[PDB]
Amino acid sequence: GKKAPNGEFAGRKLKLKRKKFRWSDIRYKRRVLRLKEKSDPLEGAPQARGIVLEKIAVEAKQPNSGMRKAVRVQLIKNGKVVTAFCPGDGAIKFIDEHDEVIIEGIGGPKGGSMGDIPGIRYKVVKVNRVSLKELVKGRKEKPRR
């Protein structure tokens, strides 16, 4: 007998087996409880605006060294401290301290910061409801306050 009971009336055993053994998929367990949804702030969401507390630059990882542009932003309803990775070359410039900065994830919600960056779970798109890739190109719009 390769595992399983096989027999007309047994099925229930089957039926509980699977479920018992389903909870060894971390991902499945996690969603079905909602640990994905509780822990890594957002309250689950696509994105979150927040006030730029300051600008900080951190070091790169193991084979690497280079100053990544990171913000510290506070999500507003979430009310949680988030350090964050900023796309683009010049950028850290166009972000004034205490402009609104909308924030997203970057590269699988699992926790995985991209290979270079240690911490950074997240991405920035925006400065005063106009984005960073729009501010890398000179023409498209340029910033205020």
Partner 1 sequence: TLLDPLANALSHITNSERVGKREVYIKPASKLIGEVLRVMQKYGYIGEFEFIDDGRAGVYRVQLLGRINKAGAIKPRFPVKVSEFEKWEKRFLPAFEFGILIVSTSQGVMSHKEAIEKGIGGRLIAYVY
Distance between CA 94 and CA 133 in Å, rounded? 11
Size of the site for RNA (CB under 7 A): 54
* Interface with partner 1: number of residues (CB under 8 A): 3
How far from the centroid of its chain's Cα atoms is residue 74's Cα? 14
Q: Which stretch binds partner 1 (CB under 8 A): 6-14, 19-27, 46-54, 74-82?
A: 6-14
- The SS3 of residue 10 is helix
Q: How many Å apart are CA 62 and CA 92, to the nearest integer?
A: 24
For residue 89, state whether it binds RNA (rule: CB under 7 A).
Answer: yes
Structure tokens at 39: 């822990």
6 forms part of the interface with partner 1 (CB under 8 A): yes
Q: Which does 62 bind (CB under 5 to 8 A by kind): RNA, partner 1, none?
A: RNA
Least Å distance between CB 32 and RNA? 7
Question: Measuring CA to CA, how many Å separate 117 from each of 67, 82, 95?
Answer: 10, 14, 20
Q: Please pick, from the candidates 49, 51, 105, 130, the single residue that binds RNA as defined by CB under 7 A.
A: 105
Judged by CB under 8 A, does residue 39 bind partner 1? no
42: left (phi over 0), alpha (psi -120 to 50) or beta: left
Q: Note the residues at the interface with RNA (CB under 7 A).
A: 1-10, 12-14, 18, 21-22, 24-25, 27, 31, 36, 44-47, 61-69, 79, 87-92, 104-109, 112, 114-118, 123
